[PDB]
């Protein structure tokens, strides 16, 4: 599963 940090990376890329 994606790490929390990897989900944050996705959020800040798209927002």
């Amino acid at each position: 599963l994606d790490s929390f940090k990897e989900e944050l990376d996705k959020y800040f890329k798209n927002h």
Partner: antibody
Amino acid sequence: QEQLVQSGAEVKKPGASVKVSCKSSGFTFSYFYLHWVRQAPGQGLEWMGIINPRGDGTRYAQKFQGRVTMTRDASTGTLYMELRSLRSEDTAVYYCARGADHGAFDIWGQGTMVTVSS
Amino acid sequence: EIVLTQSPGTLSLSPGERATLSCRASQSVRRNYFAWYQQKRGQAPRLLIYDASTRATGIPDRFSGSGSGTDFTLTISRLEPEDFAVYYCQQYDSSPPMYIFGQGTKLEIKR
């Protein structure tokens, strides 16, 4: 040896602003998301916001948006919180914290006491 | 907004006894993004448990956590003097970033 060390105690008048600093040692500063958390006298912990590793992305707790600015300086390895339009209810200890890859706060600074009074 | 309710507010126990601390989330905690912290008087908090049940490095193995969904528990199997402190639970999410703390449980020495 993984550490966060914060600047010293602050005393401010209402309406002023304060900029607290937090300098890392013992790890790669630019790899990590960083946070500020505060704790009013006798109260619990309150997350203030997060800044991304590059420093170009932040997200703040709804309570502090419009009043807080979080920045980081890769050249000095230092994280900053500026809180504006201070009121006495901003009297608190302010902590910086490192976000681990799993998201929880695994390294904490020692805290900076901020007193806001007339 | 999610709200984390800790129980009890104060827990009075003697050294050597087992401590059970509870946290209830007002809605389901995505991916068990859940942590426990200890805070001794005049000190910064320290991470004890993350992912609801994983002990952080260097934390004594008398600390353990469990739970999922809305109900989470921190257990101290046998209390030592250094364990009497305030304990906070924490919930978090990544998209969008949000971090919420329980209101704290004071673990007090019962004489």
